[PDB]
Design a protein around this ligand. Sequence first.
Ligand SMILES: Nc1nc2c(ncn2[C@@H]2O[C@H](COP(=O)(O)OP(=O)(O)OP(=O)(O)O)[C@@H](O)[C@H]2O)c(=O)[nH]1
Ligand SMILES: Nc1nc2c(ncn2[C@@H]2O[C@H](COP(=O)(O)OP(=O)(O)OP(=O)(O)O)[C@@H](O)[C@H]2O)c(=O)[nH]1
Ligand SMILES: Nc1nc2c(ncn2[C@@H]2O[C@H](COP(=O)(O)OP(=O)(O)OP(=O)(O)O)[C@@H](O)[C@H]2O)c(=O)[nH]1
Ligand SMILES: Nc1nc2c(ncn2[C@@H]2O[C@H](COP(=O)(O)OP(=O)(O)OP(=O)(O)O)[C@@H](O)[C@H]2O)c(=O)[nH]1
Lengths: 50, 427, 427, 438, 438
Amino acid sequence: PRLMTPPEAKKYFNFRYPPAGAERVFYGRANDPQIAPYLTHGLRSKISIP
Amino acid sequence: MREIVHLQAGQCGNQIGAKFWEVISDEHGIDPTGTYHGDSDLQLERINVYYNEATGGKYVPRAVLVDLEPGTMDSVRSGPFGQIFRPDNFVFGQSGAGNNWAKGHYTEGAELVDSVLDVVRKEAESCDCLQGFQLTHSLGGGTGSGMGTLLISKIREEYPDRIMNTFSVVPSPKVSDTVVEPYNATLSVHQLVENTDETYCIDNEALYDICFRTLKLTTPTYGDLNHLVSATMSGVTTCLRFPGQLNADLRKLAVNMVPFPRLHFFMPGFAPLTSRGSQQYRALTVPELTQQMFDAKNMMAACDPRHGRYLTVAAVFRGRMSMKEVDEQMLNVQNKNSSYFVEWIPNNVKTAVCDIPPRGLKMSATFIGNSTAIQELFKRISEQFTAMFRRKAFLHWYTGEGMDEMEFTEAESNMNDLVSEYQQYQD
Amino acid sequence: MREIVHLQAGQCGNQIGAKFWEVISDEHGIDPTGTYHGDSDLQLERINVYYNEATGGKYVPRAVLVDLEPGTMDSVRSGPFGQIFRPDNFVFGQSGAGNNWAKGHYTEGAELVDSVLDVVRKEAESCDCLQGFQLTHSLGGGTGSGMGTLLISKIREEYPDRIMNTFSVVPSPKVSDTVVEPYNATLSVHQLVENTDETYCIDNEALYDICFRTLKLTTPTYGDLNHLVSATMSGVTTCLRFPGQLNADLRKLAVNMVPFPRLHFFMPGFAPLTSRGSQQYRALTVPELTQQMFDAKNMMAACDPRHGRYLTVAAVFRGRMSMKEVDEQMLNVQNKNSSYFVEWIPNNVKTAVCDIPPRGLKMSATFIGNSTAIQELFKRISEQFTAMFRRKAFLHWYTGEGMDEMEFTEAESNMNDLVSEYQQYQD
Amino acid sequence: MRECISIHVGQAGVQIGNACWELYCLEHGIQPDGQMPSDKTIGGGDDSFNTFFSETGAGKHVPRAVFVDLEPTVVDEVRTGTYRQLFHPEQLITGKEDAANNYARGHYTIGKEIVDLVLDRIRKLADLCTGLQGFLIFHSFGGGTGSGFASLLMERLSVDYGKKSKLEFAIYPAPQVSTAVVEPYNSILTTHTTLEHSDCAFMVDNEAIYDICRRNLDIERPTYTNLNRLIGQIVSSITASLRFDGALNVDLTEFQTNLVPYPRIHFPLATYAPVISAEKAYHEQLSVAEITNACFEPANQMVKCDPRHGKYMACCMLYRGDVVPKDVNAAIATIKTKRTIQFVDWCPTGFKVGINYQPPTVVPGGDLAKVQRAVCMLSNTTAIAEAWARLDHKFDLMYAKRAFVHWYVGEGMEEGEFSEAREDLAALEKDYEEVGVD
Amino acid sequence: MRECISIHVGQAGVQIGNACWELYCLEHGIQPDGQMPSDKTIGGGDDSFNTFFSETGAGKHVPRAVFVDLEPTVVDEVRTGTYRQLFHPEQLITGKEDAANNYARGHYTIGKEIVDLVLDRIRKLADLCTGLQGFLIFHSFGGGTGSGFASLLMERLSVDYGKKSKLEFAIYPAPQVSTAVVEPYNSILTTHTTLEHSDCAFMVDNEAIYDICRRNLDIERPTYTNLNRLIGQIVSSITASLRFDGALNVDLTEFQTNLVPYPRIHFPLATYAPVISAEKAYHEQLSVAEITNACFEPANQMVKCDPRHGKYMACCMLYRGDVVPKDVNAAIATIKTKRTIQFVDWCPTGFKVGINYQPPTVVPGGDLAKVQRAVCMLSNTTAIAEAWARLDHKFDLMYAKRAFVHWYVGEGMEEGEFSEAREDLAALEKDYEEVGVD
Ligand SMILES: Nc1nc2c(ncn2[C@@H]2O[C@H](COP(=O)(O)OP(=O)(O)OP(=O)(O)O)[C@@H](O)[C@H]2O)c(=O)[nH]1
Ligand SMILES: Nc1nc2c(ncn2[C@@H]2O[C@H](COP(=O)(O)OP(=O)(O)OP(=O)(O)O)[C@@H](O)[C@H]2O)c(=O)[nH]1
Ligand SMILES: Nc1nc2c(ncn2[C@@H]2O[C@H](COP(=O)(O)OP(=O)(O)OP(=O)(O)O)[C@@H](O)[C@H]2O)c(=O)[nH]1
Ligand SMILES: Nc1nc2c(ncn2[C@@H]2O[C@H](COP(=O)(O)OP(=O)(O)OP(=O)(O)O)[C@@H](O)[C@H]2O)c(=O)[nH]1
């Protein structure tokens, strides 16, 4: 069988078709090639220490 | 998101659609095998409007090919992009056409509608949210007329809330080849007006004249003429697929172009047409584009609107331009011919700017107009229909399949009403 | 644990199962010699539901072959997997059949029921605790209907606490080949309706139509038809043998399809059927599977339920799915045709999710249907009996055996009761 | 001391049970082996695990739960999983036959010979327990196995042990989605049996669980993994008071007394406010106010109920994390001043606050956010009666035409018990508006 | 404290909202990442950004504005811009269907299921706000989506919050240029719906802005980028009083009280005097005198109204930069001595002066000048009635010949609402006529 996707066509295939490992979550076109240094740090703003 | 599914019908539209489709793939850069060679993000981004995607990077067209004669389809299937189209989408009947409107409208269509309506509702369930349908066919074409008139009635009740785009070609006024064609036209255009909302009017005689005019290459192929008309349909679709502050929806345009319900018949208009030396003899500037854009010689659809006046004019511009030049060029034509519009509506121009230039040139545009130049068209057929209805020539065939002169009476009577209606509101 | 024991009867069920066990064995990956090639832990895991253990890693099929004629079994034993089949399980009669129901139900059966009963209980004692039994045969089969009717009666009192799965093929409506075939139908279905709890209905004409539609290969084998139905029986049995959050027990299912006792006849439904190009033209997506799952053309059992309505719907899904695409898809079809269900019961869907995909395709399913479409089936035969019982054709054979038309009187009376019964529940 | 016992009935109730212990072993840092590193936490089994685990001299944290099921596949499958060494094989009570979705079959045919063995586990777990505040029951109403078996055992644990709490948790039947039509039989059977013995029932619905995933979590296909992770966080949040402390400490005994107004009705609702996707909360802020605006927002609850179609009587918020009481009482006062929130005037105050300084942690390979200030909302309203009102018109038509009755009377039952429930459910419904009306 | 919430409706009004926020991030120096350098301005969110940005302890500046539109093309593309990480994903309210330039389609067909979403944003923005002096609405009269949607939204925000100010900024229709002929339809619909709820509307027109480009800025081929820069500068200057201080500080509330003479008519005109190309300003000098002659020069206004065709009522002069009252009060006194400046005698004084010491900076890659002394001229004059007078003779024609009526009545509307607007417009003109009469 053919290759699942051309090397540059994965992102739009994932975006247009959410079945990127079954119907998976895709973000916008902007973040498709961006670096993602997000999963390590925290989310909450802070705790105001008096 | 909002998508479009295409209909390919009539032995003509069998030709146009492939030419239309191969242009779009060449516009988007997909190889004939179907494996898109990704080069432009935006054409990658907005290919979903017309295509679904199979496994392995294969954009399947959402088009429906229907006919009766196999050899046309076999030639189409053996074409450069037949592999891109589906045997599922290859639907046909088990009979020859004979170029009879009613045989496909009453006899042959009866056992073929069930198949296609199932197919078109299958693809309807495949897609989520639609703008509507577009149909490529002819009004003077026997198989396209019979099936097209049938399906447009059927598609109305199933989805009366979509876009019923129609793309038909007017047969040559000087000679129709088909001598029963004025019967075929009158029957079809009768059914068309009630069921349609948009109609593209194209005549081939202008296309030959344009070939002598700017193509200058004496002996073309009809496919080249298809390459011309497809560019007109490509540009009006570049609005939807491409970004830029242009308002693209046909409804966005339809309410802008259509003043009143019965106005369905419209003329295209295309931008720079260039000959052998003029490609490097042309100073491609917005003023000279608008000049050639508003040239009575650039007319290709029916005839010169010089004999009448202009109800609605709308031109979409494609390339790296600005609001101001199109604005000043817009005001020039108002000052140029102020008297040749109607006092009914001033500022009858609608403008949309596609910032995405085509592949092969940068400065381009497309024009859609609703002028008062269609009177000559149906009045021509009026003398045709009357003289042939005068002595009911070639009638024993249509009485054989089950038709009567009474259907003809109201069809032309409806035609006569639209003759007056175009007359009163301008004259 | 809970296991399954099979019976193969009638010369069709000889060809039916023989494809069906090879389907099971190759799925589990055992060689023709019988030495299992250990590749999947889970298939080594739940093989015990159908196979017992011999010395050296050979899994004996726990099914018993019964017949009267040598040649049919001569093929299967000389067939690819006759070696894994048991000569101990090959019980047969020393007489021909004649395709006469009474001979197999009164004459030939008498000296063979003793042996088969002693056999089946021996494997019954070999195993611990069944779910029940399943049978491959034909209602239109001469020896299959004759033997099974006897055995189903005897097995009822022996073990009235298990599952009486029955898999019978309905003959071709247009031509039955056998001319006394309808007589066999009455004699079978009359006794079937009491003793059985589950019945599968299969027709070859649809299998032919399936071949023209999706197989598109013109000339198939009957083994191909055996392969198709084996895929159908395998799918419902993949539920029991394979993990995944699906509740698989037939009684877990049977209580979910059977609102009232007389509902024994059920129609199957299978998952993606593809053509020569569609394999690489198909995006294997949840909608198009379910769209193809609910296709009147993908129907294969008897006839189109469009003429009637749906009593219950139950489809089990095999592949790597989630609980929500199955959730949303039922809402789509529920809203699509809400009226074509019965107002007696809303929300008649019974879905199971098997996470262990098949070997060769990943995303699959199976559907079992109980609709209001069986009326035409026994209606069709009903005119035959009222006709051919008007003057009693072919009567001297059966009457010579000891048959009396009184038996026919109640058999038709019972079915005409079912005619109203199926009619009254929906109408 | 301060401990409890978890009960997980039916294979529907076990994969969720697997997840919570997977979650629970995380905050205690329990390695899949069953032992800590060289650090010192083991002893006579007395540390943070003593309320949840049983880490005796062997050094292995023994979970205080029984995973009982009647189909061996998944329970043997999870016995091939990751923490199966931690799990005790006969605390992983399996069954060889199912109930065919039939309440009575699981209540009469097979449960008799199994509950005694389960009782053996219960008493032999009871002896090693010291305080054992109560039981934690995970089940389902539309149980192919969960419904019938739970009913008989929750009677047997009630009759011998009628002096302690029993905490039950089940998925409510989806109002417009039903995998089968047997559930209206067994679910109403479960309701009438439980009410006179059940202590405090908490329901949830998966559709809204899915709905929130693609609302704020932005997940258009979650799984049981996430679904169990969400509810596992819920049961983790309510159990943080037993694990750690805060400004004040509360117990399930206080939960029962202060939540249920009157007998019979013991059906509050659970909600978690800081449910959000990964990337969202990073570039905003969450404080007491907006999460309190989020907590009581009518579309944030996992049960299909409109609070404006009912009236409030109880509301319990469980502030897990570091928050000062200042913004707490200020916010709820503004909530009290809110006119749309129509509490019943029978209760001037209806707010039970539980403060625990411990920040809720993430699960590795998870989808939740990493939040310090969190709240679990435990509240009851009379906007719930329409759910049973939905079920009764679902049930009344079907009983009139008596579908599937041959299945049930075939295995030895009759219609009198089915008759009992309809006026009992009528008894439930007329109680709801009478307490609803002033 | 001192803040507001900006509203950006219409794919016309979305790029302009980007540019001002782009312009805004320049003067306060926001890096596109979302955080300052190592320098300390982050905290509880209280600094120059607190009036516009919500830079919580995460350090990320959150614009207090919502971008709403109905086509995903541009919004997703600007979500592919440079500051999209700053922009909240679903404050970028996107849409999937258009109004097709139809006011009522954008007012009735699709508005219902979107306003609930944006109202959630508004309240969840309102709760975190402290003072929220009002709202900044960016829209357009000839709105394909601007017209219908803004009109519906400005209703509920008025009815639910009728105690705060509402700032309306929109492009006025071009007098003789018409890209669409349904534009007179929706425009008059917007006016009659907004005259009784809008607080203060401010109109601009493109043609004169283009005319300015090639007169003094010397650009015969500008773009939106410069166009949105100029109005982006315009709103930046009026918000400088919120940003920085001066000798005295003025607020929109004073603007409302001191500009609108009487109810209904709340339509002043804004003009910025130092609009000069870069190289011109070099070899020339700017002082209060000549720039004030320029601001009162008839052709300097961006709206096609003729000052000596009308009479003046109010005037606002926002001196942003280094100025002293001495030359300030002298120049305006000379204007009072000027005879061509014909104010209405009802107001002996009509001058509202605002000084701001902060000089208007240039923007990198821009086309403005190096301004040290600047002003926006906000004034209302009777010369505006001709524009609506242009509209009605435009409007009265096609209404007699009922062009495009089938489209609007096809989606469910009637001519009575088209009827009401004309005497409303007649009411304004006769109102405009009477107030012009002494
Ligand atoms: N394909 C094709 N069609 C042409 C060409 N020139 C004129 N036509 C006309 O296009 C019409 C449309 O084709 P169909 O609608 O498929 O015609 P039909 O229904 O099969 O019956 P006929 O019109 O008699 O051919 C034909 O009737 C031709 O008269 C050409 O060069 N190529
Ligand atoms: N094996 C087999 N059976 C078929 C085929 N096509 C139709 N059948 C029918 O399947 C039925 C079942 O076979 P059996 O029950 O074993 O037949 P029998 O009892 O020996 O007597 P007959 O039915 O008269 O053949 C037959 O009656 C055939 O009519 C086929 O291709 N192969
Ligand atoms: N609690 C729970 N429910 C699930 C899960 N997955 C699907 N469900 C739903 O919960 C229901 C489980 O009820 P039952 O099937 O009766 O469970 P049971 O009584 O233990 O018996 P089984 O049928 O073997 O599972 C199913 O109908 C599903 O719709 C899950 O992981 N956990
Ligand atoms: N405010 C603004 N207007 C623009 C810009 N560019 C062009 N325009 C004008 O603004 C008008 C846009 O109005 P509408 O077409 O009603 O905009 P909409 O209601 O958001 O919906 P669309 O029809 O899709 O644009 C156009 O007619 C242009 O003449 C721009 O960058 N900003």
